[PDB]
Amino acid sequence: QPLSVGIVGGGIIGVILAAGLVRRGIDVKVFEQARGFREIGAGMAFTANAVRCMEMLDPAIVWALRSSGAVPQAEARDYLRWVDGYHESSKRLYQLDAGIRGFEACRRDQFLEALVKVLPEGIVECQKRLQKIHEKNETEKVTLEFADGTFAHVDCVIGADGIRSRVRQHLFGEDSPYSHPHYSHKFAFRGLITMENAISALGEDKARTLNMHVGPNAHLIHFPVANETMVNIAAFVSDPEEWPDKLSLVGPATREEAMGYFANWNPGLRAVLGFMPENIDRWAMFDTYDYPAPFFSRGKICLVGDAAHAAVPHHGAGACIGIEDALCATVLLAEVFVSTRGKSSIVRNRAIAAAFGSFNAVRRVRAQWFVDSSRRVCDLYQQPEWADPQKRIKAENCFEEIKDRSHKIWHFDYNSMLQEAIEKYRHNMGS
Amino acid sequence: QPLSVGIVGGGIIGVILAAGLVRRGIDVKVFEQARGFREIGAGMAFTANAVRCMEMLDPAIVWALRSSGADHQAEARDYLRWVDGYHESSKRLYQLDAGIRGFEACRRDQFLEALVKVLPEGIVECQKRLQKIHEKNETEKVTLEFADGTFAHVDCVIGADGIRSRVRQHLFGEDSPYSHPHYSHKFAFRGLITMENAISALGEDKARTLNMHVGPNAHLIHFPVANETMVNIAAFVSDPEEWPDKLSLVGPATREEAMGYFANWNPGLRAVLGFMPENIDRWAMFDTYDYPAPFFSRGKICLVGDAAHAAVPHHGAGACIGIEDALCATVLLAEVFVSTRGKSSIVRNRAIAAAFGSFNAVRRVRAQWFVDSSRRVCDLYQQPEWADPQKRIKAENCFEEIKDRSHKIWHFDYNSMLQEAIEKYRHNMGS
């Protein structure tokens, strides 16, 4: 008889996890609270390291990804560039070469769409908002209770339900701050301008490439989208106030509100905000930084993705971390499957618990480092000393650490992680 | 603008190669000359390394393997064992730990069948015997001519058609000795005995494990099969004569003809031969050792597996070498796919030949090493010195060479191979 996994959350991580597990013969169910709506129309990007992890999960995942972007005489290397956004000199500060297809970009909604088609029919169950978890003995199934009154029974439970995970609250208690994200005291304006507008304000070289503009207490990212016809703007600013608890995290705002935060910045950069639509959006940045999980797993329950370790997005790699989680969880559960197949139910459930323990041992340090790292690079992008031209040497000193932190993300040794995870699983089984 | 590959040969390698290609969105047709499966009931085993290569091609391949094969306590480890077959001492000479799941064994025909159920329908076409290949210009399609008089047109062709490959013939000329395999001047008697008979001749220990009995000019290997209820016997002997081809490479033989080759050997081994059926099989062992391929590929045509490098089976890993080929070719053609999206037909075809050119560069040394190493280790098994009580001191030193040559097979750095293949491909493309 087989092994069943209930994944709470039908986001990118939970769906990628499902693909990896089913392709190995594991019985999977994905329970998604939402009706069946895709993600936001925004773009996202994956490191070549995450794409290779996708491949190892199921090569159809990478096909889904590449059929969900656009079509790019020699081959283009991907570059991150930083520019001085506060002085009209707007000189280029720093550049990181990511190599050929160092990043591969897609539409979130289009990728999640292609992924669900890759899955066999009957994996994803929508309007299934989890509300309680009923654990029993290790040897017994776990019961998930949903808001619509239905129930489901699975051998083990993975929380892939995002920044406001319900599986997390069950683990730590609804009133513990560890069950919840908190504000990072920054929020973002987001919106589009046309390429001719972008060209007009920044010049063609800056307009056609991804560039981050540093300055004091704020920073702004822009990159072309929709085959170099549009440019996406993301403008992050500092907010000393608390975010009202049940106030939504996304909200409406005006280009004039954004322009005010940047009034002292150089002309081209203010023009870019001036070219946005009159109405734009305001995104509050919450994460798990103040109260990181003490453990990603307990018994036969495991957290993954933003549920385990949601981050502010200043590395553009938070889902990459989640894809590592999926690859690790998938390889471990596969090893449970093959190594206990002819054994009693006692051994099979012990092995699940040993696998989830191993997952926590090998993943928590890197993921929680990454959450911290994401806040740290924002602080470097927003040094007060960017304002002071006499403090330029200090301000620009930051880029070596940004380099180190990027390379630690991009050059992750996932083969060693998998090897370590298997060894810890066998050790945990008394082997 | 989708890339189509024609695979000639629906054996283990051609199908595995098709599974990896289709999972990546490449259009594949497999042309198989037979009308059903073959090698009905034969067993084979893959190294853990080869199983990891399968997983990177498509994890469903590994699931297929594991549903085509085989109580508490702990996890078994896999041992190659060698025993003195000549003298009456018959003492354990050497052993080699391959670890947990160091080999994974299955039934050939049942594995191939499971593999075919993994592919989408219509990929494999039976009763398609490649007769002739028509190459036109690099920017045109390769035309395949089948014996039933139909034709197929593909962007490129992969020869996965075995030891007597039609594609190889086309590459080197049907009159070249390079286009044909040749006799290794050894052949094998194969047959089964009952496990009860096996025990009373070798003892319980040896009967229930895989052992190779060495000696002068011959050797014998055995292992349990069909739930440890029978034992498979393969006795390899030397043949000074030529194998007058048109003489079928398989043929019937008698138990006593086998026994006559082992008359001087110790009693336990002779008892094993006597316990076989009166009628058994004779298998001539051909390979590509004498006239190894000058190249595995040319233009838009590539050889994989036995077509490229058929070996005598004294490492028991010939297919594992082929799975490496399939991994390496699959990753290259996928790199051709993404890297030439949107380019002109001319560039796409140049990319194909550049990839095949890179495949030849990275594989031909290891593959042809492994053909040599297969004959080499067989010689060490059949040293005339085994019989001489004066030269058994130097005869027993072969085992370090056995260990190194095995480890070189088992610990293949396929990730280095993949990396080197992409780099060579880019080099071949002018970047």
Ligand SMILES: Cc1cc2nc3c(=O)[nH]c(=O)nc-3n(C[C@H](O)[C@H](O)[C@H](O)COP(=O)(O)OP(=O)(O)OC[C@H]3O[C@@H](n4cnc5c(N)ncnc54)[C@H](O)[C@@H]3O)c2cc1C
């Ligand atoms: C502006 C921004 C840009 C970003 N850009 C990148 C990038 O370029 N590259 C990158 O790698 N990462 C990026 N990230 C991070 C990335 O988006 C997240 O890491 C990723 O979306 C997390 O995926 P997830 O599946 O864990 O969580 P989610 O995407 O939040 O999915 C969680 C799912 O679980 C459902 N759910 C929630 N509660 C329940 C419940 N009780 N019951 C059932 N279902 C429930 C939810 O409805 C949701 O669908 C960015 C983040 C932001 C804010």
Ligand SMILES: Cc1cc2nc3c(=O)[nH]c(=O)nc-3n(C[C@H](O)[C@H](O)[C@H](O)COP(=O)(O)OP(=O)(O)OC[C@H]3O[C@@H](n4cnc5c(N)ncnc54)[C@H](O)[C@@H]3O)c2cc1C
């Ligand atoms: C006794 C023995 C035991 C072995 N045990 C092992 C083991 O345990 N583990 C391991 O890794 N390796 C083992 N090997 C090696 C392994 O079997 C081979 O290397 C493997 O079969 C090669 O697979 P292939 O698909 O390339 O060739 P094949 O298995 O020979 O298949 C080639 C296919 O191409 C078809 N074909 C041929 N010509 C044409 C044509 N003109 N047109 C269309 N189709 C054509 C054939 O019908 C066939 O289906 C063993 C070999 C032998 C002889």
Ligand SMILES: [Cl-]
């Ligand atoms: Cl992010």
Ligand SMILES: [Cl-]
């Ligand atoms: Cl072999």
